[PDB]
Design an enzyme around this catalytic site. Structure first.
Site, PDB file in Angstrom:
ATOM      1  N   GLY A  46      -2.122   2.321   2.183  1.00  0.00           N
ATOM      2  CA  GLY A  46      -1.625   3.418   1.952  1.00  0.00           C
ATOM      3  C   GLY A  46      -1.907   4.534   2.661  1.00  0.00           C
ATOM      4  N   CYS A  47      -2.453   4.625   3.600  1.00  0.00           N
ATOM      5  CA  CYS A  47      -2.726   5.146   4.689  1.00  0.00           C
ATOM      6  C   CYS A  47      -1.124   5.551   4.954  1.00  0.00           C
ATOM      7  CB  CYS A  47      -4.082   5.027   5.202  1.00  0.00           C
ATOM      8  SG  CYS A  47      -5.208   5.376   3.982  1.00  0.00           S
TER       9      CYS A  47
END
Ligand code: NA
Ligand code: NA
Ligand code: NA
Length: 157
Positions: A46-47
């Site tokens: 996600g990051c």
């Protein structure tokens, strides 16, 4: 009046350690818009998706005179490795002591595992040229997020 969040005065003078070895402060960004996006961990799916999304939009943020900062509590070296691998052309703040995170109230608690567990909640903020926090996104949905932040910035600017 326009602020959605009030930061302690000292927040603006905290030394923020960046990828690449320099420091900045929020006050040093006076006169231009600043996007600050908090994420929980370097080099996770996600990051990475979120960082690549902001990176792809940099020219659009530039058009508006805005700067971006990503923030997690990973080390400067972790951040250097993440930026180099992904090709990020904006800095990452190594908020190892969570001072900046606490100021923006992004350290959230969850009752899990029979414990009270604290962690970074993915969140983004828009800081005006005069240092007001004029928009916030909390519990961020990565898909479409950077586009939405850019649109809101344009609307505000
Ligand atoms: Na990486
Ligand atoms: Na600013
Ligand atoms: Na909001």
């Amino acid at each position: 009046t326009d602020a959605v969040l009030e930061l302690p005065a000292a927040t603006f003078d905290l030394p923020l350690s960046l990828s690449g070895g320099t420091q900045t402060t929020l006050r040093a960004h006076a006169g231009h818009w600043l996007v600050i996006y908090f994420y929980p961990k370097d080099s996770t799916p996600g990051c990475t998706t979120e960082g690549l999304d902001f990176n792809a939009l940099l020219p659009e943020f530039d058009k508006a005179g805005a700067k971006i900062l990503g923030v997690s509590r990973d080390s400067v070296k972790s951040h250097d490795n993440f930026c180099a691998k992904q090709g990020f052309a904006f800095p990452l703040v190594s908020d190892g002591d969570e001072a900046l995170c606490r100021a923006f109230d992004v350290i959230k608690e969850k009752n899990m595992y029979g414990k009270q567990v604290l962690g970074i909640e993915r969140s983004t903020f828009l800081l005006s040229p005069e240092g007001q926090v004029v928009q916030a996104w909390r519990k961020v949905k990565v898909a479409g997020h950077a586009d939405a932040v850019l649109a809101a910035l344009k609307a505000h600017a």
